[PDB]
Design a protein around this ligand. Structure first.
Ligand SMILES: CCCCCCCCCCCCCCCCCC(=O)OC[C@H](COP(=O)([O-])OCC[N+](C)(C)C)OC(=O)CCCCCCCCCCCCCCCCC
Ligand SMILES: CCCCCCCCCCCCCCCCCC(=O)OC[C@H](COP(=O)([O-])OCC[N+](C)(C)C)OC(=O)CCCCCCCCCCCCCCCCC
Ligand SMILES: CCCCCCCCCCCCCCCCCC(=O)OC[C@H](COP(=O)(O)OCCN)OC(=O)CCCCCCCCCCCCCCCCC
Ligand SMILES: NC(=O)C1=CN([C@@H]2O[C@H](COP(=O)(O)OP(=O)(O)OC[C@H]3O[C@@H](n4cnc5c(N)ncnc54)[C@H](OP(=O)(O)O)[C@@H]3O)[C@@H](O)[C@H]2O)C=CC1
Ligand code: SF4
Ligand code: SF4
Ligand code: SF4
Ligand SMILES: [Zn+2]
Lengths: 47, 155, 146, 342, 206, 95, 114, 178
């Protein structure tokens, strides 16, 4: 990639990171789901 | 000074354990074929001080290749519970990490990690022989960064 | 399109009234203990229930047999139905004695001032099916509706 | 409670229990069973380690794929206790070594660790602080630990009230420090036990009985302050407690009685070991303070467990200490011990 | 025609001719010899007559089938005799294969051919291990492929894809012990089965 | 548009931020949260509208075999813009 | 109903075949505990043999009892031999999974299990 | 056609010249010396080994490794939540629960591979009608833990926000073969 360099696309990284193994700056999963349920709203008004 | 002497001893104690680690003649599936291609003249274990000894008493790391069935499982922890205890583990494959195929079958454990504790996980269905080699170079620094005499001084 | 409703404002945990007067969250071991205390205490005719709407035909019995073992018949429902003559008796005063399929096999329908269109919308469809195909005539009694 | 602390799941090993918990001493003997009895039923178990990553490998299992998350700390700082107990409903205290280190003494370990935790745990807002003192430790004891393990039993109540405090007896199990202590007296000529063993009444308890007791104490509506005492049945006497061991471990048995004039000084010779000592000033004296009768305390049986006798689970912990020609000997054999009621 | 695997009409008469041969020579315990479009033969039999048509096919001048290949057991739980048990054989002499299948219940065993074809010493054992079809007169019936405490016959369609137990290590007892099944993903049975027969006049008329 | 919640964690493409009272925020302790900073909700909005001449036109993703099965749009609406469900590219008619 | 029997006839001939099997376990439980190291004494090893025979007594069909014996001869051939392990034979005890409450009230303090 | 491999025995009345020829094979065991010189022929060869982290062996543009979610040249996550990439994934590894993006567009809220599953078979990059999910040429992504192999969507877009300079060259090299 000096005489046949790639195409840059204005999202691709500039600072490449190695295999973050067991440090911080590693990966931890989610449940990227928006929680899919809604329980109830008790009022602050006794009777 | 005492700490500086102990950090270097604990850096010097590991150089032996990490260079001359003697893995164990395991097998069980396709994945083991790549270990042979890591004993092959392309990606040499022996160049890294890594030698197959086929007994655990002489061993320093288990490499778990292949589907760890329910019948083989006692023979896998009967074997992990036969080494000395600087013992390390490496799980080659997606059949050994989670049971990639056969995760939902009945005669397959859903991970080597159900049974023996593990230091590192190599993915790939047949992980390339240059992908265990990245792991047993990474296990070779995962205990470069162990501090077993430091945490004796401060204790 | 009401399946959005089963995931909103929906009760999950058993709540219980607090010493302040607000509702808190507790366990079944603590709520049933409080309810049972107020059932061994008051009995007979000061103990009642009002069912309504979206209710089984299984909890109606267990909630009936429970309150009959403390000798109560105050089992009521939200929407009124008569009792002056043979209300709960004789299962022909609160039913489609005709089959809903029977609307086809019919020449006349008197609709009292109700919307089959919006009360049980699909009893109006059999009427429309039997409005088109077999020459049927209807007479709606009260409340002109489109 | 919230929506995920809900226990919506059968049994365990992939289910939820709402028992997101910190268990500090989960690198040693008792905590490896506690994590097992939490992780098996389905529960997040925050395991703070001050130690080698290699010594916490056996904790990587007994955990169902996310419920075992580890983090580092040391007792001599703040902001490493205010990260573990943050996202908790439960906190458990299992610290206590057996001896004095160069940096952490009996008071730095049994008084100042629960105090800092339980205060740093009350600020977070958690509901439970299961604490583990040791039975026989009221005050004015002959030792120096049990004279300080009641100080912690007060410096926790004065910091985090409504805390559970378990006072177990001397525990036994695989890789213990109790049966594998007397078992290894065989390396010398014989056993130097005091007063020919008498005057030391002991009711030991099995680990899982303690652990199943803890795990059920973090779920009851009961135990919102109730002290406990995990003692177990078969209130043995020491001479017969050891004769059972050396009949189980078939090597031999002859006493060699002593006073505390010397048998507490031999511990000061082996106490001059930079490593894990074989004995101490005080590890000799717990064995001999060990004397108690159960008076009123709740115990196991009103917590969930039906405790286990030593008659049964003694193979597992002494089958190693035997020689070939006794490596299979069938506890049908070996003459069970004499139990005293008093 | 360039993409449709020519039928090769010659070796469909050879086998059908040998089909009548095996039936009229042996009317007992034989019903509906059949031969597919794929030029391969099928001779279904009554289970009391297994060995008399495996010794025949091992010991006969014009039916030399002395080499066994498989012994399956197909499960079809919409019939009494659910376990169809399929043999398939091979002539070195004739270069022809054949299929000799049977039936059975969950309890109606089938006598073993270990005397005829010793190869079925273990093909029968797996059928016992996988399905549960007993075999009279068999040296050492027992499991091959399943665990030493595996209650169940797994290839029965009644058996769940993930079984009833799974194993893990209990530090409290220091063993690889079983507590019942507790998944983490719940294998998602997809409903990939369309309408639209796809094969008309090759179907089921009521 | 990664904007931090009042608790402290970051927001994803989708609001999924664990609430302050959630126990499943331990997993980022001594760790962090892999979250992509380049939200496609906005980058596609940072893209002009091709003011084409014809009413029915084609979209691809720069190469017929390299993405975006070729679908066609009806640009009769002058008020809204026509978009392909695959990309989010907008168009107009110019007349 | 005019069905074909196997290894027996009417049930009374297929219970000696069951007792000949109990006649093989009761002499080979003390053998296993010696061979392979086990915590069990002998009596909670033998009582489990009866416990696993006093589970299938409700059967009333010879062919079924003719069949359950066979699977027992398997698991005795697998135990008189050490083809099993400490693991496999100490798997019958179900020591791990907590015994769920049979009672109604506690059975739905956890789980929707009828 | 068949070929005999071990069939030469025919007593030709072996002359005394053919005896020493056999009697010096034995008593000097020379057939083995022809093996010692054979291994001596290889220590003087170039050992094919390669210094791995400095000399990583040869691959090809279709080498399928770590998954990644590609992206159009103007942002816009290239996935459109079809679900014909878990309907084929034989290891049953992918869960891609989706929604309308609130732009009116159609995108994932959820995407997943359990890389402890994922046989690395290629069915998902050849099924994707948009070239969103690919299977990159990574093979150094070993991990010390089980959780780091549960790539959801943020570890898997930004991964595709990493290798896109290196993927597209291989995809551009191969869209004629597929
Ligand atoms: C005679 C016995 C002495 C053994 C130690 C000598 C040093 C070994 C060495 O060269 O590598 C050490 C290592 C360097 O080698 P390395 O093993 O870390 O990595 C080698 C690099 N590759 C794999 C790319 C080829 O240096 C250290 O950081 C160890 C420090 C402790 C050693 C004692 C210092 C006092
Ligand atoms: C300089 C590096 C030395 C290289 C020597 C290694 C052997 C390689 C030579 C090539 C080869 O393989 O020849 C094959 C050939 C074999 O060819 P062949 O197997 O195809 O046929 C042999 C000929 N017939 C069958 C007729 C008998 O070897 C020979 O023919 C002659 C040598 C065999 C006898 C040598 C071994 C016995 C001598 C022991 C006495 C001591 C010897 C001196 C030792 C010095 C140390 C003390
Ligand atoms: C002048 C008149 C007087 C003269 C008097 C003297 C008369 C002459 C005496 C001649 C003696 C001849 C040589 C004697 C030794 C020969 C030993 C021998 O015969 O070995 C035979 C043996 C094979 O035996 P067999 O079982 O029959 O196998 C063939 C089956 N088809 O073969 C073997 O199995 C051996 C195989 C072992 C191979 C191991 C490899 C050895 C490595 C070699 C090291 C090389 C360096 C040599 C160093 C030498 C030491 C300095
Ligand atoms: N087991 C027994 O014989 C009995 C114990 N008990 C009580 O039960 C509890 C459990 O103790 P047990 O676990 O058995 O003993 P352990 O020897 O197993 O020590 C338990 C843990 O305490 C940690 N620890 C001790 N001191 C410090 C310190 N100063 N700073 C940080 N961590 C520390 C150790 O961490 P590391 O591993 O890093 O050293 C160890 O993992 C204690 O309260 C003990 O007194 C009561 C009766 C019987
Ligand atoms: S992961 Fe793939 S290569 Fe490895 S054992 Fe399983 S199927 Fe074989
Ligand atoms: S096939 Fe491609 S575009 Fe469709 S959901 Fe899968 S990854 Fe996304
Ligand atoms: S490569 Fe194959 S196994 Fe892996 S995610 Fe894609 S389809 Fe599934
Ligand atoms: Zn487009």
């Amino acid at each position: 990639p000096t005489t046949n360099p790639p195409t840059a696309r204005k999202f691709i990284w500039t600072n490449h990171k190695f295999n973050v193994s067991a440090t911080p700056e590693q990966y931890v999963p989610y449940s990227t789901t928006r929680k899919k349920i809604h329980e109830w709203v008790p009022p602050s008004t006794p009777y | 000074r005492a700490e500086y002497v102990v950090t270097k001893l604990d850096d010097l104690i590991n150089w032996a354990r990490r260079s001359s680690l003697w893995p164990m003649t395991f097998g069980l599936a396709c994945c083991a074929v790549e270990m042979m291609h890591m004993a092959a003249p392309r990606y040499d274990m022996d160049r890294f001080g890594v030698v197959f000894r086929a007994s655990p008493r002489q061993a320093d790391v288990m490499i778990v290749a292949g589907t760890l069935t329910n019948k083989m499982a006692p023979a896998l922890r009967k074997v992990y519970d036969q080494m000395p205890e600087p013992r390390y583990v490496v799980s080659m494959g997606s059949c050994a990490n989670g049971g990639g195929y056969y995760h939902y079958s009945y005669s397959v454990v859903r991970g080597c990690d159900r049974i023996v504790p593990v230091d590192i996980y190599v993915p790939g269905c047949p992980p390339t022989a240059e992908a265990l080699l990245y792991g047993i170079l990474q296990l070779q620094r995962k205990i470069k960064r162990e501090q077993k005499l430091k945490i004796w001084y401060r204790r | 399109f009401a399946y959005d409703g089963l995931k909103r404002q929906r009760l999950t945990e058993p709540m219980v009234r607090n010493e302040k007067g607000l509702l808190t969250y507790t366990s079944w071991e603590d709520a049933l203990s409080r309810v049972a205390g107020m059932l061994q205490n008051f009995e007979g005719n000061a103990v009642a229930a009002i069912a309504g709407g979206l209710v089984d035909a299984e909890a109606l019995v267990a909630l009936k047999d429970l309150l009959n073992k403390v000798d109560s018949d105050n089992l009521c429902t939200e929407e009124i139905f008569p009792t002056e003559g043979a209300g709960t008796d004789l299962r022909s005063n609160y039913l489609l004695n005709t089959t809903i399929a029977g609307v086809e096999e019919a020449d006349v329908v008197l609709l009292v001032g109700t919307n089959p269109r919006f009360e049980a919308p699909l009893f109006n469809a059999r009427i429309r099916k039997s409005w088109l195909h077999n020459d049927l005539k209807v007479a709606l009694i009260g409340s002109p509706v489109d | 409670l919230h929506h995920a602390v809900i226990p919506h799941g059968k049994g365990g090993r992939s289910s939820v229990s709402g028992v997101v918990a910190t268990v500090f001493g989960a690198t040693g003997f008792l905590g490896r069973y506690v994590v097992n009895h939490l992780g098996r039923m389905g529960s997040q178990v925050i395991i703070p380690y001050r130690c080698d990553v290699y010594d916490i490998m056996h904790l990587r299992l007994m955990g169902d794929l996310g419920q075992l998350t580890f983090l580092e700390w040391d007792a001599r700082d703040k902001d490493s206790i205010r990260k573990a107990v943050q996202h908790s409903n439960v906190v458990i205290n299992l610290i206590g070594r057996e001896w004095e280190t160069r940096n952490f003494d009996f008071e730095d370990v049994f008084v100042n660790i629960p105090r800092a935790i339980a205060q740093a745990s009350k600020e977070a807002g958690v509901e439970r602080f299961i604490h583990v003192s040791h039975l026989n430790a009221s005050m004015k004891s002959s030792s120096k630990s049990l004279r300080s393990k009641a100080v912690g039993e007060k410096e926790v109540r004065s910091v985090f009230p409504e805390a559970i405090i378990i006072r177990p007896s001397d525990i036994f199990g695989r890789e213990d420090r109790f049966l594998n202590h007397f078992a290894n007296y065989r390396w010398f000529l014989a056993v130097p036990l005091v007063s020919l063993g008498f005057k030391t009444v002991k009711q030991p308890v099995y680990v899982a009985d303690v652990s199943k007791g803890i795990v059920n104490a973090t779920k009851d509506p009961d135990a919102v302050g109730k002290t406990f005492a995990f003692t177990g049945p078969n209130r043995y006497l020491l001479f017969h407690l050891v004769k059972y061991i050396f009949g189980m471990t078939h090597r031999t048995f002859i006493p060699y009685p002593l006073p505390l004039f010397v048998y507490s000084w031999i511990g000061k010779l082996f106490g001059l070991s930079p490593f894990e000592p074989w004995t101490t000033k005080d590890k000799v004296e717990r064995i001999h303070i060990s004397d108690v009768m159960p008076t009123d305390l709740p115990g196991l049986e009103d917590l969930g467990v039906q405790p286990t006798p030593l008659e049964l689970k003694s193979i597992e912990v002494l089958r190693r200490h035997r020689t070939y020609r006794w490596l299979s000997s069938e506890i049908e054999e070996t003459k069970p011990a004499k139990t005293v009621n008093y | 025609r360039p993409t449709v695997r020519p039928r090769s009409d010659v070796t469909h008469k050879q086998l059908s001719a040998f089909g009548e041969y095996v039936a009229e020579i042996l009317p007992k315990y034989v019903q509906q010899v059949q031969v597919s479009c794929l030029d391969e033969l099928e001779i279904c039999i009554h289970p009391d007559g297994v060995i008399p048509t495996l010794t025949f096919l091992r010991d006969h001048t014009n039916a030399q089938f002395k080499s066994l290949a498989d012994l399956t057991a197909v499960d079809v739980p919409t019939r009494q005799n659910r376990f169809e048990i399929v043999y398939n054989l091979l002539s070195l002499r004739f270069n022809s294969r054949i299929r000799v299948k049977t039936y059975a219940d969950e309890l109606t065993p089938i006598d073993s051919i270990v005397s005829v074809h010793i190869a079925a010493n273990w093909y029968e054992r797996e059928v016992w291990d996988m399905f549960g079809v007993f075999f009279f007169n068999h040296p050492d019936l027992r499991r091959i492929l399943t665990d030493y405490g595996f209650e169940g016959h797994p290839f029965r369609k009644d058996f769940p894809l993930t079984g009833y137990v799974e194993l893990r290590y209990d530090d409290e007892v220091k063993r690889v012990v079983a507590e019942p099944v507790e998944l983490a993903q719940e294998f998602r049975k997809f409903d990939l089965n369309s309408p639209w027969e796809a094969f008309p006049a090759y179907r089921q008329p009521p | 548009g990664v904007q931090v919640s009042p608790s402290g964690e970051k927001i994803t493409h989708t609001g999924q931020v664990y609430d302050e009272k959630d126990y499943r925020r331990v997993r980022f302790v001594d760790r962090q949260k892999e979250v992509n900073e380049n939200f496609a909700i906005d980058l596609i909005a940072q893209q002009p509208v091709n003011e084409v001449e014809h009413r029915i036109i084609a979209c691809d993703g720069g190469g017929g075999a390299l993405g975006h099965p070729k679908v066609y749009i009806n640009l009769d609406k002058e008020t809204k813009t026509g978009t392909c469900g695959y990309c989010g590219l907008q168009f107009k008619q110019h007349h | 109903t005019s069905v074909k029997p196997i290894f027996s006839r009417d049930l009374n001939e297929a219970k000696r075949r069951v007792r000949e099997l109990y006649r093989a376990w009761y002499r080979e439980v003390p053998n296993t505990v010696h061979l392979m190291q086990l915590d069990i004494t002998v009596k909670q090893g033998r009582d489990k043999v009866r416990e696993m025979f006093m589970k299938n007594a409700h059967v009333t069909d010879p062919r079924v009892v003719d069949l359950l014996v066979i699977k027992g001869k398997m698991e005795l051939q697998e135990t008189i031999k050490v083809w099993k392990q400490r693991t496999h034979v100490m798997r019958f005890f179900h020591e791990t999974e907590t015994p769920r409450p049979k009672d109604f009230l506690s059975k739905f303090y956890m789980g929707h299990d009828p | 056609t068949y070929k005999y491999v071990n069939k030469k025995e025919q007593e030709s009345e072996v002359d005394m010249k053919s005896a020493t020829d056999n009697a010096a094979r034995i008593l000097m065991w020379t057939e083995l010396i022809r093996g010692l010189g054979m291994t001596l022929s290889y220590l003087f060869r170039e050992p094919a080994t390669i210094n791995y982290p400095f000399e990583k062996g040869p691959l090809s543009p279709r080498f399928r490794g770590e998954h990644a979610l590609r992206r159009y040249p103007s942002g816009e996550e290239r996935c459109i939540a079809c679900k014909l990439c878990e309907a084929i994934c034989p290891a049953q590894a992918i869960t891609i629960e989706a929604e309308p993006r609130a732009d009116g567009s159609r995108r994932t809220t959820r995407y997943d591979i359990d890389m402890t599953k994922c046989i690395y078979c290629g069915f998902c990059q050849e099924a994707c009608p948009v070239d969103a999910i690919v299977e990159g040429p990574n093979f150094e992504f070993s991990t010390e833990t089980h959780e780091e192999l549960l790539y959801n969507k943020e570890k898997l877009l930004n991964n595709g926000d990493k290798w896109e300079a290196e993927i597209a060259a291989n995809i551009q090299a191969d869209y004629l073969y597929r």
